């Protein structure tokens, strides 16, 4: 299960960081070179099968990585992300045991590489399924191995955010930015080539007179993106970083050293719910996958308990859908907190054995009363930490200030935790 | 101040790019007429007439120009002095700036040859 495949599969690893340990700004050089790569990495492929739909998971899929039928971004970092996540699951969930010898953590990275590359091969096969099938596979792995090396040289290396999360962040900066200035439009009732950009709402002032009805189209634009939408989008970002700083402080006398107080915190977002939101997302993705098997044996009657009601009118024509959608959102994130914490760490015994394992004892009482010191925080700071994210994403939908909604709130929450992770190693 | 230099280099590709073609604005890239089968593939930079551009042509030209100049700025501002990390950071700086310089001039040479059909 681990003892056999891991010793043989060691082919072409990465080089661990040198003895040039402390530095300020060549750290940022190792960031910026990867950002040159993902200038470059989002660039055109070499095969002329020009298929009609770009990608099938292009929108949600696009939200994760946006080079759909596009560049060497390979439709996602979804290999490294999914392969990292279920690896940390099956390490934390004891379906598979824990390796804490350095040989086991090194081969743990090796198996990480293994499942990552196998999943790249899976995505390659599943997108290509003509006679021109050669060398696509060679390109993809070469560009899978590159994203692998760039991510693992930005965890043990520079790495502060991650390799991963800052790639997602910068590519999301770009996906706003193509909407910010937009040069082309292939040629409505009036007004070509201006769709919810600020350049659009700066070219709009150059074309049309009667600037009152230039303001009105700028601030209450419905079918295209809106700038009131962008104000609400910014507003949500500000509030969510207001709520990331919600943290519980716990000071700790370290064992065997006089009075150093590196206080362990518990933030409410509580791994920022990259389980728990994607818990909320992917069950409602797997049925809208499997409604395709409902066409034979639907987008109508099954939708009334499936989706948000999509309407800015708060009193839109069905309160049943609104109530059940919001209650399902809140209950789903809360319930998947109170079930999630037991597997990917940071439950009561998890925290206790990590702190004993790193020699940190609460001052108030005995070492294995620390459990009862903090067991009256972690479930609620799971559950509330579940709950007032989803209701928060209610405020991401109830008001359309979100470029993409819930998911954008929460992937930038990924970035915000990501900054802490990168900063950690300074 | 040096912010005035920032203002000027900001203005540089801005009026190298498309202030001339603000009022004479020509939309980004599509001009193929089926070529034998496939109808409206967007072509390129304009090639046959020399003075014209599109929005997509001009921005690319401007971007090529200011990165080369600010690469020379980086050669001046850090590579000639000797103060920071004398084996790791410096070598990166000369490395990526020489890459900037060589590949930039090479590609702009290409982007005058192929729209221009000049004997190289």
């Amino acid at each position: 299960f681990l003892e056999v495949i891991k010793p043989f599969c060691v082919i072409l690893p990465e080089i661990q960081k040198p003895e040039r340990k402390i530095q300020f700004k060549e750290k940022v050089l190792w960031t910026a070179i990867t950002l040159f790569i993902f200038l470059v990495c989002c660039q055109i492929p070499l095969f002329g099968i020009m298929s009609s739909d770009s990608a099938d998971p292009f929108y949600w899929m696009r939200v994760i990585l946006a080079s759909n039928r596009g560049t060497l971004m390979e439709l996602g970092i979804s290999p490294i992300v999914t392969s990292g996540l279920i690896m940390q699951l099956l390490a934390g969930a004891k379906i598979i045991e824990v390796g804490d010898t350095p040989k086991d953590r090194a081969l743990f990275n090796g198996a990480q590489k293994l499942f990552g590359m196998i999943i790249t091969i899976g995505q390659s096969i599943v997108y290509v399924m003509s006679g021109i099938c050669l060398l696509i596979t060679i390109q993809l792995f070469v560009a899978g191995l590159i994203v692998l090396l760039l991510d693992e040289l930005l965890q043990k290396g520079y790495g502060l955010g991650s390799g991963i999360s800052l790639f997602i962040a910068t590519n999301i900066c770009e996906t706003i930015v193509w909407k910010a200035f937009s040069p082309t439009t292939v040629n409505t009732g009036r007004g070509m080539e201006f769709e919810g950009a600020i350049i659009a709402l700066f070219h709009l002032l150059a074309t049309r007179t009667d600037k009152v009805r230039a303001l009105r189209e700028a601030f209450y634009r419905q079918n295209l993106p809106n700038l009131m939408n962008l104000i609400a989008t910014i507003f949500v970002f500000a509030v969510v970083i207001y709520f990331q700083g919600f943290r519980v402080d716990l000071p700790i006398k370290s064992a065997r050293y006089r009075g150093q107080y590196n206080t362990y915190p518990i933030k409410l977002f509580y791994t920022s719910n990259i389980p728990i939101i994607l818990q909320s997302a992917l069950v409602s993705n797997l049925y809208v996958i499997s409604q395709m098997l409902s066409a034979r044996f639907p987008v109508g009657g099954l939708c009334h308990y499936l989706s948000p009601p999509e309407s800015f009118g708060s009193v839109l024509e069905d309160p049943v859908h609104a109530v059940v959608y919001i209650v399902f959102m809140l209950g789903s994130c809360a319930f998947f907190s109170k079930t999630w914490i037991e597997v990917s760490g940071s439950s009561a015994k998890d925290v206790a054995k990590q702190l004993k394992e790193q020699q940190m004892v609460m001052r108030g009482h005995r070492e294995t009363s620390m459990v009862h010191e903090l067991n009256r925080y972690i479930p609620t700071a799971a559950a509330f930490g579940g709950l007032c994210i989803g209701a928060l994403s209610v405020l991401a939908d109830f008001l359309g200030a979100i470029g993409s909604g819930t998911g954008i709130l929460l992937a930038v929450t990924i970035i915000y935790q990501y900054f802490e992770i990168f900063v950690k190693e300074q | 101040a040096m912010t005035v230099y920032a203002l000027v280099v900001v203005s540089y590709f801005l009026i190298t790019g498309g202030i001339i073609y603000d009022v004479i604005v020509e939309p980004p890239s599509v001009g193929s007429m089926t070529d034998e089968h496939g109808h409206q593939r967007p072509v390129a930079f304009l090639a046959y007439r020399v003075n014209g551009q599109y929005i997509m042509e001009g921005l690319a030209s401007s971007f090529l120009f200011t990165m080369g100049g600010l690469g020379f700025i980086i050669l001046d501002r850090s590579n000639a002095p000797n103060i920071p990390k004398l084996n790791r950071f410096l070598l990166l700086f000369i490395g990526f700036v020489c890459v900037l310089l060589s590949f930039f001039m090479a590609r702009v040479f290409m982007r005058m040859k192929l729209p221009g059909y000049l004997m190289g």
Partner: peptide, 29 residues
């Protein structure tokens, strides 16, 4: 990255893509 070749390696890969992209397109038009 004790060494910088991994980066150089990435550059080589892009060149292989860069050059090999137009290399087959040489015989076409």
């Amino acid at each position: 990255v004790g060494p910088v070749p991994v980066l150089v390696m990435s550059l080589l890969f892009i060149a292989s893509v860069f050059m090999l992209h137009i290399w087959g397109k040489y015989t076409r038009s």
